[PDB]
Amino acid sequence: DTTITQNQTGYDNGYFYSFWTDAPGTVSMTLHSGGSYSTSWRNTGHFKAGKGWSTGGRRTVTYNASFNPSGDAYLTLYGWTRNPLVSYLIVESWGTYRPTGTYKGTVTTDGGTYDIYETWRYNAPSIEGTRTFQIFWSVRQQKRTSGTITIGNHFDAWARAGMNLGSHDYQIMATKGWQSSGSSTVSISEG
């Protein structure tokens, strides 16, 4: 198993992966068989790590995870588009804080109900560099750490609320963290 500690993307065991942190050395990602990876972090800054696909789309994905944050972290299907430049999160679980934004509606899919939010980030890292851009969110009303995400149901609900996506870049089932410590193991596949 390859352990990753420096910012990079690539492919492992048939799947795209991405690892990023602004606090190198405080977080690692371990790449396991197929669509599986783990993370470990201690007194970190920001990080995001996951496996998935280099080009996102309306795929139906199934995941199983162990998610053990001590502080602020998300377990989330995470991706980006350009033209328009948008980052999006379907948040399945979280640590001390449940993420919110400007309320835009709800979507009921895959046995749960999600609040839909939009936020703006100003002068922040993006796939295109330091930019200002929208974030689209679906945040589950109750935490869960395994199941199926019918991504197209989220994209369509966002579109009904005027939240429009562009051409897809990557799409990963991610562990994201801000400060504190923790660990995760996440196993992702399409279908």
Identify the DSSP state of 35.
T
Edge to edge, the sheet with strand 102-109 lists 8-12, 15-21, 46-53, 167-178, 72-82, 86-94, 129-140, 112-126, 102-109
Indicate the residue type of 114.
Answer: Y
- Resolution reading in Å: 1.4
Q: Please provide residue 185's backbone torsions phi and psi, each rounded to the nearest 5 degrees.
A: -135, 130
Q: Are 31 and 183 contacting, i.e. CB atoms less than 8 angstroms apart? A: no
Q: Are 149 and 77 contacting, i.e. CB atoms less than 8 angstroms apart? A: yes
The span from the CA of 77 to the CA of 176, in Å, is 10
Q: Are 115 and 141 contacting, i.e. CB atoms less than 8 angstroms apart? A: yes
- Compute how many other C-beta atoms are within 10 angstroms of the C-beta atom of residue 98: 14
Method of structure determination: X-ray
The length of the chain is 191
- Compute how many other C-beta atoms are within 10 angstroms of the C-beta atom of residue 9: 12
Q: Tell me the two tokens of residue 116.
A: 């839909």
Structural domains in the chain plus CATH codes: 2-190 (2.60.120.180)
Q: Are 184 and 51 contacting, i.e. CB atoms less than 8 angstroms apart? A: no
The span from the CA of 19 to the CA of 10, in Å, is 9
Distances (CA, A) of 58 to 5, 11, 163: 30, 21, 15
Q: Are 65 and 145 contacting, i.e. CB atoms less than 8 angstroms apart? A: yes
